[PDB]
Write a sequence for this structure.
């Protein structure tokens, strides 16, 4: 559809978790999603011919 | 490094009307770790306001364990919010109570905010 | 009643709870009307035996 | 002993850069119990710094309800940290903001920490 | 307004008995948000008490970041409970420690209460 496209990547998961008998809720991790927006451009060229006879 | 921490916390907000008497404001269970006790005054204590308010416990002779408050009109900017300098651990079920005496002003009100942790503990390691 | 919650800490920890609902009272009857009887405000079947704790 | 308590509590931390202006720092729901508001300056304020920061509310005209903080040079240790003496019940969705004015410092920063309890309320029997 | 807030909060309570040395009281995770540090003096300190207490960090050289408490006789009433005026974000795993020196007393103890929020954040809408 040549609409502006948007690709997404999943960032790698980092950050220290939880040690020992500690609740998962003491250090949540963040699922991080990055994106890009690709917009189209229009471009062109043209040749103008001379009189048919020539 | 292990430890045991309190994880469950409650805030109790009670409201009383600055008349001569006692008010059973906050119910503490045994083992409650009181970490904040604050009294907000609501209203305009008029001049000649000889009203005295003390936040303490119910089962004590002088119910002023946490706060004493007097001469509200001396400076309505600082005597309007007064927090307690003392934390507390409840050995038994306690009742935080406000004792109001010599109430000579009208439409003045008090709000007691008590932030306390529950006796329950969990074991955490960092 | 027993309550076994195997879903604490995303199902890593677990919780077991016990609950009861019970009505317990020392038998002490009152008269349905205001008539006064030997029974109307007395421990039905109890005598107290108090001594020193030693 | 029955009572109603707030059991859910949040801490919102927001850092701003002490440039002149007003910053939308913290979003309070209606019925939130604000029990702690503290501001820490982070940096090394030069002498002759007549900068003034003030933590208050967005909708109100004067943003000095919670904290005023002037003359960050007289004592570079007592003014590093300043806690608010006032608790607050949010009767509407509020926005705690910090107004900075006369900013003649550099690289100095301000971290606001707000501890507030949610409106939700449970019943407790002790 | 969206925001990221800390929802998990722990209270850690530790006791020490005021004999000269260093005690490893509280373990702070990396990213923790210390919102209250308070020290209570249990026991009646003797007159002419030349003792000193200080609440700080294990790694730091002078263990006096949060709290200091000297001359437990100048004003016992106000020298019974002392709250730290500082809030702290932990950039690494930390240990809040007591540095007590010159213990010319006994039958006296200190109780440290550290209320801190955990690093994890959730997003809230209001």
């Amino acid at each position: 559809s040549q609409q502006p496209f948007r690709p997404r990547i999943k960032a790698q998961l980092s950050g220290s978790g939880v040690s020992g008998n500690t609740d998962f809720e003491a250090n949540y991790d963040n699922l991080e999603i990055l994106s890009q927006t690709i917009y189209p451009d229009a471009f062109g060229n043209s040749l103008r011919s001379k009189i048919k006879a020539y | 490094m292990k430890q045991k921490v309190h994880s469950v916390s409650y805030l109790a907000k009670a409201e009383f009307k600055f008349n001569n008497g006692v008010y059973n404001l906050v119910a503490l269970p045994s083992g409650a770790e009181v970490v904040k006790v604050s009294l907000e005054v609501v209203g305009n204590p008029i001049a000649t306001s000889t009203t005295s308010v003390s936040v303490g416990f119910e089962d004590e002779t002088t119910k002023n364990y946490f706060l004493t408050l007097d001469n509200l009109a001396v400076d309505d900017a600082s005597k309007k919010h007064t927090t307690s300098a003392k934390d507390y651990t409840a050995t038994s079920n306690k009742v935080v109570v406000a004792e109001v005496k010599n109430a000579n002003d009208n439409n003045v009100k008090g709000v007691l905010r008590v932030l306390y942790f529950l006796p329950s503990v969990i074991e955490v390691e960092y | 009643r027993f309550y076994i919650d195997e879903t604490v800490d995303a199902g890593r920890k677990s919780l077991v709870g016990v609950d009861c609902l019970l009505g317990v009272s020392k038998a002490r009857y009152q008269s349905t009307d205001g008539v006064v009887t030997p029974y109307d405000n007395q421990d039905y079947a109890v005598i107290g035996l108090v001594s020193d704790m030693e």
